[PDB]
Symmetry: D3
Subunit: 251 residues, 6 copies
């Protein structure tokens, strides 16, 4: 019902993901019909706000695909809002220290242990108190993933990996390749060797490892490493690419 | 500037089209970047209204691709609205007689010759009277296409083809195959032979012939017949198909 | 998955309904959490269009409650639109002859038997062709209800009740009491005696009978008569009434 | 509080009007702060639907300016929708016979006298039944204006003017000049003499005469003739003209 | 006309409030027709942004109910935006020090005394400079309420209560009970005794005390203590509860 | 095609600007038809969010007028969003140190030199990777303006003017006159003398100077000083003023 199946499957299987940046309920529903294990509603790099993410959670809710929401940043009030509209799995960009990851764990948990604002009567998260024990049980079905995607993030990796309540570390190859001076070129061996080592350290610390690659060969290679959550394409890239390919057959 | 290049090119070249049923400005802009000769904003089979079609005309306006709007039906007031938001080419579904096609010609022209409501001060069509002689020159850049896609439409084809101000007849293979008792199966020889004969009669009467086929082989065959406007795919079908194909490489 | 359970339950049980006139995907979701057998998305008397009805179908789709859509009128093109966004049950207002009810049956069925426009590729109804045999099986799961709520409707009742493909006749007590010279007073014995006789005639002809009443005693009495689909309240009335009642405890 | 002051002032004073075609609640509020006697929300020549018109009724409702809504056509179901969202004055375009004007009167009145669909519980018009006697009193505060703006309209002027419940006849100079073969040149003596005689006949039959002119000299001449409701400008034309004039001071 | 009646009544009477988290202009208008002294537009726990809050200010503005806006956090730029759209009373969540309360006072006042960004020409607050002296008089009609709802808030209660320009302290029972280790159980004696003492200290320092309770007995007890602004219910909770109660009469 | 002409013209000519605070794609299009060198889409003082700014970039993109976006504040994540939707010129309000101006430069540039988040695949800025070398060439076409409009801004003026990558300093006369104790009276000689000296210092340090004034005489005087970018009016002010002026001709 509101069991976080993406959260349970981190320990259980490898989950194939689709990036959703078309930023509307109608597009999110089309993606939701395909059968991806997870759909990333991108609040960071697509023109989304709280209301458009809600619309996309409502579309996707009818379908087995599990929703993961990336906020624009690790903003504690915005995390409060996204949890209340019922986003059960968050991906926080650009996480750079154990202290920042601990703030994000606290942002996802109610007082007295955390700092998640309490407003269950008003929340789709509680179905407006129609889930009777929401305030006692919400935490069990919240999944927190953080992105390592900067030099400082790699510099604090072991420390982030010992933070209790971080379920998964996701590697951002676009941000990380740029930070490493290989902007636009994550396929470089220098970047790939750091990514592979990063995945191994994530899985050796008992956390789930995730990544995005539209490159089919790199995606399969990440899956052979045991990477637990692999996004394998992007709705905007697939729409543009297929329309271009179709046109080139007639130019 | 507001020259209807789709209209001029009916006499000049074969125009490759993309069907736009994602029904928002953002999606219409992605399609507009590909380089299709024309984009069909579907008011009949996608969840569009006047305001969403406006948003999509505004997105597309920055790009060389020419916009064609299909209204839900040959409704004279709705044609008035779509012309005022600045749609220069309309495709009218389910046209079934010379009398209906003549009503549609009149719907696209100002009195005293036509019945297009006059409200140029308020219209994006006139850029709010920033096009000085709009009321004298609008008609020159309006293009009217009608669909033949029923038994009655085929029964009135010669009569529709002698109506002055019909620039083009578009064949709807989904509606026509269903009307012919081959619903879901336009690829049948019975349907194809009627389509090919219909195209030849359209071009022999000096009008532009158009059609949609997502089948690449049928599309190329329609282009070899000299069909002037051929839509060759559908944004919703390309997004769904590419996301499915991508997923099957990992299932 | 896309089985019309409301349609099946017409022969099987009494279905308790809630009127949805708050005209937004968020309000439709709240209503969908209660457990009503059916939700009437009101496109006649609430400020809805095709796009707002789509948002409310997507909200409701995640919940067992079955959606029924009332269009503003028996308009064939608008029926086409509502079917393509995936409304499986329609309630047509102000139906007044067998001829009009037969037009509505045809409006819900594909050619060659009906006049439903074919555009399955673009439709949420087909899940963008992800339901493989949609064009062959669509009609099995479409349910057509018609409203008798005028003197001319009652004058054509036996004729409407012999129209094959009318699944149900719903009585509109507001429109009907007004047509009978008892505007705002459907509780009058003159009106109630016609309502009861009408329900009996509907069930004697083997069709489902429906009605709305916010009066609990009248709703229970219609349920004791065997009325198959009974709406029992209206979201706007319940929001307003409960807010007034609460304020009167403090004035 | 829901007294139709525009309707009362038709017998009492000359009411100065502003055309609103910017088609959003924010623009309609700006216009509402100026102090016009009336504001014409234009559903015919501005990109409005029922929901955009509702938003503009809500903006305007805090201000003394009275709202008048022009629907796209004399469509009975659309009239029903506009009345239910709480539009108390309607301006019907392109009215051409006593029969059509009588249909419009009926479209604004409840059965048994009229054909206005009854659904007061759901309507902003009744404030969701918070106006207790709404169904008994609604018609007293409904004002029906019809546009005469075609040859056929002028050919049926005396017949339209004897139709009980037509409160006002509005002359459309753009449509009328077009219909008379002077498209874009309403200023012509041929057109002006017909407008003047038309106004005198409207007032001799004891109905309110209305018109729009953005020409100040023509507006004042129509006011000296006793024209009861004169729109004197258009928000889109004032926005465009003021921005152009400002720029020419710097080119 | 733009007099902040909520602000004046803080010294004068006890004001009864309704929480508005249905987050659209249509729902806010329904609530506005009931006669609550105030309406809390909830930007913290309902899916609102600046534009949705503007729509709800516009709906409510026609009605005597006074609007109060809760922003998501004490963010100075967001406060600037909410003031400019014309919100005259703000409820700042989670205020924890005299320093933070002083920052919020400054955020509501123009330089040189405050840090409210100046842009009156563009603002609904000034009615686009149609309120002539707006920049000189704005602060007289701005009301600042701060929430005490954490241990740190209670630890800084005396300091917050000596901050000039804090008009009211609102107690958040959900956040406060959570912070005290009684999450979801504000009814506990431990929590109630802290709330009662907190209210008495707020009123002894000559500020207005406020609270929300949906429990009628607790609401009336807070009113007997002299609490100046008591919210007594939540629109989402009333909608859900009334629809559930109605359904259980038929299960 | 995506050349920043506003940026090039900073070294080349004086650019006449219009302030856009009507906050919608339709109004932004009207303004885009006039021929202003630049249009300021105001995300600080008009009710805009990322999605409404996107709609207005898409409207404006078809016209030669160059778009400049003011965010609500110098927020690094919000700058990321506005750059990804394809805003090429940003005006940062209330910049007060070289440290803050350097943060803003970094916020507009990709790593490793800056901290702009990398997500080109999803961005209108890259046209969804249809601009092939976007990640290599993006910064060449990004223009950063900062506002000096506080005492601390003037106290850090020389330091801000030595920050490499600040293309322009814009003076905010409303915020600055208020900070100087002359709120609502920027026309005072004390204020004007600081504005003139500030412009001279900006141009002496080889940066572009900008300002807004709706006062024609002050705008011409700033143009005679060589001010590179001068906004000369505000859409809301021009809509309101022209509507009031028109009404005063009839009162
Ligand atoms: Ca709409
Ligand atoms: Ca928004
Ligand atoms: Zn990243
Ligand atoms: Zn068709
Ligand atoms: Zn009815
Ligand atoms: Zn007209
Ligand atoms: Zn709280
Ligand atoms: Zn400023």
């Amino acid at each position: 019902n509101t069991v976080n199946y993406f959260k349970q499957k981190l320990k259980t299987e490898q989950q194939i993901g689709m990036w959703v940046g078309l930023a509307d309920g109608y597009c999110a529903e089309i993606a939701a019909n395909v059968g991806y294990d997870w759909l990333l509603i991108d609040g960071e790099h697509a023109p989304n706000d709280v209301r458009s993410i809600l619309a996309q959670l409502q579309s996707i809710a009818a379908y087995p695909s599990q929703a993961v929401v990336r906020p624009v940043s690790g903003d504690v009030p915005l995390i409060k809002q996204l949890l209340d509209i019922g986003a059960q799995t968050l991906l926080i960009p650009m996480v750079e220290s154990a202290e920042q990851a601990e703030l994000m764990v606290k942002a996802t948990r109610y007082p007295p242990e955390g700092i998640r604002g309490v407003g269950a009567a008003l929340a789709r998260a509680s179905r407006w108190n129609n889930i009777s024990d929401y305030l006692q049980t919400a935490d069990e079905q919240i999944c927190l993933l953080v992105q390592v995607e900067s030099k400082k993030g790699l510099d604090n990796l072991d420390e982030i990996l010992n933070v209790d309540g971080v379920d998964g570390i996701f590697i951002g190859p676009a941000d990380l390749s740029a930070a490493l001076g290989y902007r636009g070129n994550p396929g470089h061996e220098f970047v790939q060797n750091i990514i592979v080592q990063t995945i191994q350290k994530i899985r050796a610390a008992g956390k789930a490892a995730g990544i995005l690659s539209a490159d089919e060969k790199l995606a399969k290679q990440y899956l052979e490493l045991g990477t637990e959550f692999v996004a394998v394409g992007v709705d905007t890239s697939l729409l543009m690419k297929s329309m271009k390919q179709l046109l080139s057959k007639f130019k």
